[PDB]
Amino acid sequence: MTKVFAYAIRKDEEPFLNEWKEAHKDIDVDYTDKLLTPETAKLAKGADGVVVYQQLDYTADTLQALADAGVTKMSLRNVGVDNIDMDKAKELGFQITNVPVYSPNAIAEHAAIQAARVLRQDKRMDEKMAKRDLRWAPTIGREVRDQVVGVVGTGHIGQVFMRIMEGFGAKVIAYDIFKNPELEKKGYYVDSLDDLYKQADVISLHVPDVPANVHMINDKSIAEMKDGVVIVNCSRGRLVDTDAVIRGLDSGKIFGFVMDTYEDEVGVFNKDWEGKEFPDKRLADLIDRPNVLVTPHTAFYTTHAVRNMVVKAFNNNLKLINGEKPDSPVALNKNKF
Amino acid sequence: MTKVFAYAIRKDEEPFLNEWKEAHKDIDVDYTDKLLTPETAKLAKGADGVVVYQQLDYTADTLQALADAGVTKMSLRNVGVDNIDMDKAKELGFQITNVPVYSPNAIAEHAAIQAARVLRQDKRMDEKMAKRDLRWAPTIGREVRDQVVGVVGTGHIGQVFMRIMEGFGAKVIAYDIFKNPELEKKGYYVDSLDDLYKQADVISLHVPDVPANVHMINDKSIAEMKDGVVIVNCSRGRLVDTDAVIRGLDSGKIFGFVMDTYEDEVGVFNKDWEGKEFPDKRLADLIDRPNVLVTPHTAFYTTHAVRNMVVKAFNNNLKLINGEKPDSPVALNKNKF
Ligand SMILES: NC(=O)C1=CN([C@@H]2O[C@H](COP(=O)(O)OP(=O)(O)OC[C@H]3O[C@@H](n4cnc5c(N)ncnc54)[C@H](O)[C@@H]3O)[C@@H](O)[C@H]2O)C=C(NC(=O)C(=O)O)C1
Ligand SMILES: NC(=O)C1=CN([C@@H]2O[C@H](COP(=O)(O)OP(=O)(O)OC[C@H]3O[C@H](n4cnc5c(N)ncnc54)[C@H](O)[C@@H]3O)[C@@H](O)[C@H]2O)C=CC1
Numbered sequence: 001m002t003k004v005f006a007y008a009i010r011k012d013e014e015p016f017l018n019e020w021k022e023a024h025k026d027i028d029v030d031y032t033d034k035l036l037t038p039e040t041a042k043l044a045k046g047a048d049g050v051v052v053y054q055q056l057d058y059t060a061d062t063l064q065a066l067a068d069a070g071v072t073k074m075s076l077r078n079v080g081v082d083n084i085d086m087d088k089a090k091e092l093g094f095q096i097t098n099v100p101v102y103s104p105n106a107i108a109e110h111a112a113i114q115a116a117r118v119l120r121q122d123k124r125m126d127e128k129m130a131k132r133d134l135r136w137a138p139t140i141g142r143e144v145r146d147q148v149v150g151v152v153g154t155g156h157i158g159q160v161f162m163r164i165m166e167g168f169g170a171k172v173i174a175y176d177i178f179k180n181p182e183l184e185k186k187g188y189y190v191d192s193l194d195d196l197y198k199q200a201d202v203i204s205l206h207v208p209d210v211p212a213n214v215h216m217i218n219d220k221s222i223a224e225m226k227d228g229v230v231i232v233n234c235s236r237g238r239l240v241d242t243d244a245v246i247r248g249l250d251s252g253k254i255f256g257f258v259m260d261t262y263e264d265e266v267g268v269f270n271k272d273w274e275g276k277e278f279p280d281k282r283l284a285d286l287i288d289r290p291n292v293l294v295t296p297h298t299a300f301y302t303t304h305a306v307r308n309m310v311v312k313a314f315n316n317n318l319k320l321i322n323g324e325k326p327d328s329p330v331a332l333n334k335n336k337f
Numbered sequence: 338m339t340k341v342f343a344y345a346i347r348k349d350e351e352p353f354l355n356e357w358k359e360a361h362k363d364i365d366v367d368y369t370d371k372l373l374t375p376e377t378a379k380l381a382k383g384a385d386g387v388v389v390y391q392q393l394d395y396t397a398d399t400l401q402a403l404a405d406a407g408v409t410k411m412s413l414r415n416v417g418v419d420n421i422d423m424d425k426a427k428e429l430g431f432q433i434t435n436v437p438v439y440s441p442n443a444i445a446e447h448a449a450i451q452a453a454r455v456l457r458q459d460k461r462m463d464e465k466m467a468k469r470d471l472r473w474a475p476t477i478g479r480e481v482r483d484q485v486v487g488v489v490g491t492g493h494i495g496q497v498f499m500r501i502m503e504g505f506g507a508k509v510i511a512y513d514i515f516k517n518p519e520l521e522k523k524g525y526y527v528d529s530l531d532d533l534y535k536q537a538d539v540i541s542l543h544v545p546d547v548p549a550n551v552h553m554i555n556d557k558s559i560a561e562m563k564d565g566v567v568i569v570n571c572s573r574g575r576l577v578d579t580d581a582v583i584r585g586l587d588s589g590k591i592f593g594f595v596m597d598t599y600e601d602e603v604g605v606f607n608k609d610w611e612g613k614e615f616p617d618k619r620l621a622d623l624i625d626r627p628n629v630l631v632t633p634h635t636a637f638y639t640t641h642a643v644r645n646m647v648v649k650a651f652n653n654n655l656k657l658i659n660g661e662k663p664d665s666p667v668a669l670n671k672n673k674f
Contacts, residue, residue, distance in 0.1 A: 010474055010475065011474075011475060012474065012475050012477050103480065105480055105482050105506075106478065106480055109453070109457075109480055109481060109482065109505070110457070110478075112453075113450060113453045113454060113457065113459070116446075116450050117450065117454070120446075120447070120450065122450075125632060125635065126632075129624055129631060129632070129633070130624070130625070131611055132610045132611050132615055132621070132624075133609050133610070133611050134605065134606050134607060134608055134609070134610060134633045135606075135607045135608065135609055135633065136607070136633055136634070136635045136638045137347060137348075137349065137638075138347070138348055138349045139638070140349050140638050140639060140640060140643065141447075141638065141639055141640070142639070142640050143440065143442055143443055143446060143639050143640065143641050144446055145442045145446065145641075146640065146641055163504055163506075164504050164505060165504075166504060167500055167501045167502075167503065167504015167505065168446065168501060168504065169442070169500075268471060269471045269472075270471050270472040270473065271471055271472065272469075272470045272471070272472055273469045273470075273471060274468045274469045274470050276469075278469060284469075287466055287467075287469075288467075293463075294466060295462060295466075296466070296471045296472065296473055297473070298462060298473050298476075298478070301473050301474075301476075301477055301478060302457075302477060302478045302479070302480055303477060303478070303479050303480065303483070304480050304482075304483055306477065
């Protein structure tokens, strides 16, 4: 007998929780559907720690709303932490953990395919089909195996991204602040961005949303690019100046674009605006461009990650519930960029 | 000087004719829009050679019609020679050159992308955005990296598709008449096909439309098949049993199917049916299935292919005009079948 209560368990999470309960024989495990609400906090009744994925706020309030229920043991299924009352959280001694890495693959994967679909002209081709225009001319596609893919950033994610395109048999060029002694041995690294910006056919960003990096793709970076470049930003939105790429698209400079992350994303993304008055037009003019692919921050959303998501969580909590050293305690002091 | 006259030149070919002429400085080159017919055959007047692609037969007469303008050196820009009058050709002793391979990469590339796509459920997402549902759950993607991919057929193309998938990091299984001694050593082969149809998640057909293979995927092949399988045919169509597949898609045994080839395709594909009555109803039901990906025999339509088509074509022909041993002499093998 042990109790962990889960908050915000999606259907897609259901089965992972099973395998982990399926195996974790001795613990008592129960979830529910409503996000952890000051009001819901209460169901967490006499269960040791709580596993809950949420972008909605765990106000200083839902903390006691949950505190009093009998738990100081709470761990997120997600990467995030800035949505909790961290100050009242300690005022309270509240123990949280984070699950910081679910498959870097799904993101690396997700950009390759979006990238590759824009080079092929797959959406123009798919539009003709829907309309029942079954001929292939002149919607010709460019081959992956024939471009020069430049990667901006060389961490877990981006390396994958590297090997994938390598597999297509393309020429990968790379960029980073920290020239990973290893990759640079094979010559991947260029001296500077202004170099990769004019010999890269495809550009995939894989670098944190830094004060420095904020709007690296804009009227100036772009005018240095080749003609008919392809731009991919499956990382942090602010790296790009939307009105800028828009412009590049407008003249024929940028050949296509891939956006699974937008700057004015928050609030707009992930909300069903169907049947509503569509709230943000350029995003809406972008979504429909035939040589653009928008996606709502889906780069991460995959069977393998989610499994990570859930699980790296039931564990970390089991370690909390039980009193043992967990993985990435909630303080994750300067681990993050 | 010299003169080469070309026929049936697509706009997309246009652009490569020049990088060629742009090279071959001492030769005059000139082309036509419409195909060659006794009617036209005059047009290549004085042109030492004629380059040309078409499906209309180079009927019995079309030849002299050509002959009289003064030319007998003609080289096709595409693979097939079963639409040429071999005997007259020979009674005429005309000299011809086909162009046999136009980027095999193009086809293994297009198949690998389409699969990844279905694997990830992109269509369903994109259908979502269009209606404007900017939320992700439950359109969870499966990672190519996590799958077992079975390559049926191991030549130029299947080989290339093999490499890419390992770029993704999937477990690749193959199967083949002639177990290439090299891959076989690395233990990729499986002894039989029923081996394949049961450990394999994605299956990619890359083998010939042989009286033997003519319906390998039918209601029996499938049932061996794994739940959540993903079938991918980008080669000959007769290999799949469309009704088999829909039943499997309908039941749910099939996760996704991807088609660039269709058996009841001659006549429908390559036709603009927009605003006319659509000729084939499963074909369409399929075109629109949330999880099918139909494309009209387009796996080869790439900048690289169409480039060799021309280039390889003009080349070999110049070896004709010049009088050299060129690539791909089509020998009058009476039986065009
Ligand atoms: N979809 C399109 O746009 C077009 C597709 N194609 C098709 O592409 C495939 C690819 O061919 P490839 O892999 O090069 O074939 P092979 O070298 O012949 O095969 C490699 C090995 O296959 C073995 N093999 C032969 N027969 C069998 C059987 N029955 N079972 C197992 N293994 C077998 C062989 O021994 C080799 O070791 C191709 O098949 C083709 O149809 C072509 C394009 N033009 C078309 O539109 C078209 O003609 O349909 C376009
Ligand atoms: N779109 C989505 O769904 C999500 C996107 N992301 C994004 O995915 C990317 C991949 O992540 P990681 O590999 O963990 O990142 P990372 O920061 O480790 O990327 C690789 C390298 O970039 C660094 N870096 C920081 N600032 C830089 C600068 N100005 N120039 C060059 N290099 C710089 C590092 O020092 C590091 O080794 C992130 O950068 C992030 O913004 C992360 C989660 C979800």
